[PDB]
RNA sequence: CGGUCCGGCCGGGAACUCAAAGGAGACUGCCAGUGAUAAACUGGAGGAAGGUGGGGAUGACGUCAAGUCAUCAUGGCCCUUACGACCAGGGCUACACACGUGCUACAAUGGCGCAUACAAAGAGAAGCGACCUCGCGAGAGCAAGCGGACCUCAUAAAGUGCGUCGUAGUCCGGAUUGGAGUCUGCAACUCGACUCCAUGAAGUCGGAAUCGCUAGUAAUCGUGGAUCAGAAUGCCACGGUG
């Protein structure tokens, strides 16, 4: 059976399949490389396949909807680490460690009557 | 074929409370009975000024549910419809009746 | 508002379906279809003759108890004065402060 | 801070040499929240001056860095109707910060081709100390030892 | 400063709404009007028969007008004989089909809009504003209230500069969203001017 | 390089080169080099006197300089001498379109004076 | 400014330029008709045309043609 | 999993994303240090969340005879063959100027051309209006679906990939004006929005002085809505990057 793990950040919603061998990575039908255009939103879901090994050891498969590039690579980081945990569970004390477990509550401010954005307030006139 | 019940109430409390109406009498007279499904809610939502005459920054912000549940009744079986039809529901419950 | 500005929109509305709903409306789809009569038609000279106030476009939205012209809401048909009046006394259906 | 007595934010290291001071460099140049273009143009600034000094990207930005930094400045105080400047010795975590700060604002003063030029060139002045930052930690210097007195 | 309506702000939490009805944005404002209309003909015409709150639920296309009031035998007359008068003319204003319901108010001395319309009908018969208050306030308490507060503003007893007085005797807490708050306004017109009455009733938790 | 009034282009890109010309934007430049056969993105350099004479006969077409000048100025004159809204403001110096006065109308009115 | 089906006039004006053609040129012909798109055959006619208080004598002519009638009586007085 | 027009699209599967009702959870509860052994604070463990976790709603007695008799209601006063009422046209949009709030800029962290990855939240029958066709275009003709997690408005833009311009009042910046049009509406002259062609102002970063904002904030980048026949750089709301 899949080992199975749910990430979420921001507006976006990701879901992590685990099965053991190779080290591939398919997001929404496609490749790691052809749907993110940033190398750094890249590194961030290898982030959880550093403290715990992995070459060619298992292989993932993922999809993601709602939010943006760093929103969605946010998510799939939580997703890798909550299927890791599924796995094996003893490899809570390294996800904890480096703060990958933590789901990031960092939700966008609503916009608030009478400020122009979420805190920004209009300029004030003296007279 | 299959009977589909739209139901529509400002009330959440008393939408749900009206659909186990529905659910427990069509599955009592021996019908095949699909959710109740909980649809996404419409939340109309209006910014008043409350002030009668100038203060732009002091508003009121309201907003008006639109909560929506769906029951699809399978087996329209005559001891169910008749069972149903006769049902006395919520008067504040707008019921949809789709063939 | 005034007792004559609240008449004034009871007759831009008696004039609006008796006309410019049935009658009106045939005659400016007519000074739109370019297969039939594309200079001897009239129809634009004889929609001056129809009453000005007929014209749908010359009504104003108006709170249906005070006659307010300004800081209209069709959902409610009131101002927002008169809507938060209501709001507060439960008048309004389903309607309560909203927080997010 | 008047009650609150806050600690600081500990930011994400470099996506390339695993630097959190680099970090720190990138969001200090970054403008309207461009990461992506930010970093764009500190790599490219990096890879035109480490080429055209002699290797070594991290020592490079080490020898530019350690004469744009500042070991004294002062600090505005009305005691008595009079404004005195109070000689402060700053701190290692501000000592680096003003120091990155200066070397972004001298550069965007330039009037080079390109920002991953302005800064490349920034940083060959300031590693020689020959430029308008490292003409920023030499005016903060003579203020610091004229208000010598008021230590 | 500017208080919440104690009423609104409690609406889904511990107090009900006066309209029930569901409606689209097609005749939501139609049927807004209707209630408009038909709430202020049996204010009109049941002044003198204590009605304190009016409910109006539209089950499917008819009207459905709960009265609540005080004195219910003057509303419903010799033999329904003043149901069948309203019922007649409600239908008239809504449409569709009318049917009348009378819900009894027992103790009307701790209802917000009654003693609110009993300040107003005792001020506009030359009665002094502190009496009728501290009567309001020792009636309510005396019958169960676990607070009251009675406030009148503008011109009392006939004075050039106006003035906001208030009696409140027990517990009032307006910021616990829990706290049974009935609260009513009612407007004296008086020969010198217009005196707004506001009540609060603290009727207890949950 | 010299084509039709008297204007000489610089040694830049041939659509930015034809734009030099009063009655030439990003568009005509455009489908003057698509209807005589040439690049837009090639220099004066190369472009032979048999492609320059292509080009002026093609510009030829459209009232371009001078001859277009006199044509803007007759259809302002014309307004004037009318005496409707649209030529008693060309008249005035003041904005002509509809714009504001009270505030903002610069362009027209040109530096303010206390 | 508008759409090329029709330029538009006031019937009351129209059947006015009518009965100034056959009958001969009279007076100027007070009208209040600013809205009206001039035509070929208003060309030396008088037409009192409304600023909003008194009647602007405009002489027709033929450059005058597709123009409106109220852009030759100034509504707001400036000096 | 069975079948492929390789589209969840069809049988199916109720696992998961999500939808929305009920419920659990965080209380300085545990540990340690500081502190009058108290209160509390600091740090740590566990935990998705830690010290009111983030945001909102909630605004005491009262102050300024502070704002609103033009939302409405109303004591008094005033007009009542007129201060009432109807109509057409005009004005509220005037323009020597001064101040306040904004938008757009002055550019290579940028302009342009092609290619392309990723949202959230809303609106809709006198309505949103696809697909198809015509027009460079604004649009127009024809005409499905949808009172809507189904259909439509609607291609998110920043970003990324390649090429170009190369510090120039410029391939920056778009004002102003000329010519021709589109739509709505009885009717766009005064005084609508938008398009096409041409025009290419000032401005190369702003004196004295002054404003906002402590984290998913500022900055920036798009999206929707109310009013509304039509008329958003305003307002109200939404997420992206950060
Ligand atoms: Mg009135
Ligand atoms: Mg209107
Ligand atoms: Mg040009
Ligand atoms: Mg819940
Ligand atoms: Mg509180
Ligand atoms: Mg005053
Ligand atoms: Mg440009």
């Known amino acids: ?127 | 074929q299959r009977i589909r019940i739209r139901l529509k109430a400002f009330d959440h409390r008393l939408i749900d409370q009206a659909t186990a109406e529905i659910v427990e009498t069509a599955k009592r007279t021996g019908a095949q009975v699909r959710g109740p499904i909980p649809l996404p809610t419409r939340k109309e939502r209006f910014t008043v000024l409350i002030s009668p005459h100038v203060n732009k920054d002091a508003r009121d912000q309201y907003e008006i549910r639109t909560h929506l549940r769906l029951v699809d009744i399978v087996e329209p079986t005559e001891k169910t419809v008749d069972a149903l039809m006769r049902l006395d529901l919520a008067a504040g419950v707008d019921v949809q009746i789709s063939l | 508002a005034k007792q004559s500005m609240k008449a004034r929109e009871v007759k831009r509305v008696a004039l609006a379906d008796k006309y410019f709903a049935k009658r009106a409306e045939l005659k400016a789809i007519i000074s739109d279809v370019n297969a039939s009569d594309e200079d001897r038609w009239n129809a634009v000279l004889k929609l001056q003759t129809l009453p000005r106030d007929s014209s749908p476009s010359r009504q104003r939205n108006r709170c249906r108890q005070t006659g307010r012209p300004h800081g209209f809401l069709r959902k409610f048909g009131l101002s927002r004065i008169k809507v938060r009046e209501a709001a507060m006394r439960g008048e309004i259906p389903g309607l309560k402060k909203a927080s997010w | 801070p008047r009650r609150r007595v806050i600690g600081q934010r500990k930011i994400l290291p470099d996506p390339k040499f695993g630097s959190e001071l680099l970090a720190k460099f990138v969001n200090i140049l970054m403008v309207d929240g461009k990461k992506s273009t930010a970093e764009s143009i500190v790599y490219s600034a990096l890879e035109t001056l480490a080429q055209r000094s002699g290797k070594s990207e991290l020592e490079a930005f080490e020898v530019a860095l350690e004469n744009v930094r500042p070991t004294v400045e002062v600090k505005s105080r009305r005691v008595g109707g009079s404004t005195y400047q109070v000689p402060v010795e700053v701190r290692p975590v501000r000592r680096n910060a003003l120091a990155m700060r200066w070397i972004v604002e001298a550069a965007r003063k330039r009037g080079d081709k390109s920002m991953a030029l302005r800064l490349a060139n920034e940083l060959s002045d300031a590693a020689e100390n020959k430029g308008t930052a490292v003409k920023k930690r030499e005016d903060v210097h003579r203020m610091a030892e004229a208000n010598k007195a008021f230590a | 400063g500017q208080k919440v309506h104690p009423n609104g702000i409690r609406l889904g939490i511990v107090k009900p709404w006066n309209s029930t009805w569901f409606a689209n944005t097609k005749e939501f404002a139609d049927n807004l009007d209707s209630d408009f209309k038909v709430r202020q003909y049996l204010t009109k015409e049941l002044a003198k028969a204590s009605v304190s709150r009016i409910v109006i639920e539209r089950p499917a296309k008819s009207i459905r007008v709960t009265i609540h009031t005080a004195r219910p035998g003057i509303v419903i007359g010799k033999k329904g004989e003043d149901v069948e008068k309203l019922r007649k003319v409600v239908a008239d204003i809504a449409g569709v089909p009318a049917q009348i319901n009378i819900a009894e108010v027992r103790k009307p001395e701790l209802d917000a809009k009654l003693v609110a319309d009993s300040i107003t009908s005792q001020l506009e018969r030359r009665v002094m504003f502190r009496r009728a208050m501290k009567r309001a306030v020792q009636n309510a308490m005396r019958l169960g209230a676990k607070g009251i507060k009675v406030e009148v503003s503008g011109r009392l007893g006939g004075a050039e500069i106006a003035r906001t007085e208030w009696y409140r005797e027990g517990r009032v807490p307006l910021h616990t969203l829990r706290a049974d708050i009935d609260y009513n306004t009612s407007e004296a017109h008086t020969t010198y001017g217009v005196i707004g009455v506001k009540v609060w009733i603290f009727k207890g938790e949950i | 390089a010299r084509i039709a009034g008297i204007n000489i282009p610089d040694h830049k890109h041939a659509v930015i080169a034809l734009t030099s010309i009063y009655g030439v934007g990003k568009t005509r430049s455009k489908a003057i080099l698509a209807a005589a056969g040439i690049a837009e993105d090639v220099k004066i350099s190369e472009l032979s006197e048999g492609q320059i004479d292509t080009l002026r006969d093609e510009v030829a077409k459209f009232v371009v300089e001078g001859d277009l000048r006199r044509e803007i100025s007759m259809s302002i004159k014309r307004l004037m001498d009318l005496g409707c809204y649209r030529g008693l403001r060309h008249r005035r110096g003041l904005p002509v379109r509809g714009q504001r006065t009270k505030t903002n109308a610069r362009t027209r009115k040109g530096p303010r004076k206390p | 400014r508008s759409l090329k089906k029709g330029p538009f006039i006031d019937l009351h004006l129209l059947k006015k330029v009518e009965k100034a053609v056959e009958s001969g040129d009279k007076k100027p012909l007070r009208t209040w008709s600013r809205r009206s798109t001039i035509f070929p055959n208003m060309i030396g006619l008088t037409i009192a045309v409304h600023n909003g208080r008194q009647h602007v004598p405009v002489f027709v002519t033929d450059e005058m043609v597709g123009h409106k009638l109220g852009e030759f009586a100034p509504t707001r007085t400036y000096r």
Do not use: C, W
Not at chain 1, 67 to 96: F, K, N, P, V
């Open chain 1, 1 to 127: 059976n899949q080992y199975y793990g749910t990430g979420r950040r921001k507006s976006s919603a990701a879901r992590v399949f685990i099965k053991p061998g190779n080290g591939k990575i398919v997001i929404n039908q496609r490749s790691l490389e052809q749907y993110f255009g940033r190398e750094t939103a890249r590194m961030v879901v290898r982030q959880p396949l550093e403290l715990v090994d992995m070459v060619e050891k298992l292989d993932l498969y993922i999809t993601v909807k709602g939010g943006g590039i760093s929103g969605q690579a946010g998510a799939i980081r939580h997703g890798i680490t909550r299927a890791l945990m599924e796995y094996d569970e003893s490899l809570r004390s390294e996800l904890r460690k480096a703060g990958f477990v933590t789901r990031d509550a960092r939700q966008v401010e609503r916009k608030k009557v009478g400020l122009r954005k979420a805190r920004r307030r209009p300029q004030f006139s003296k007279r």
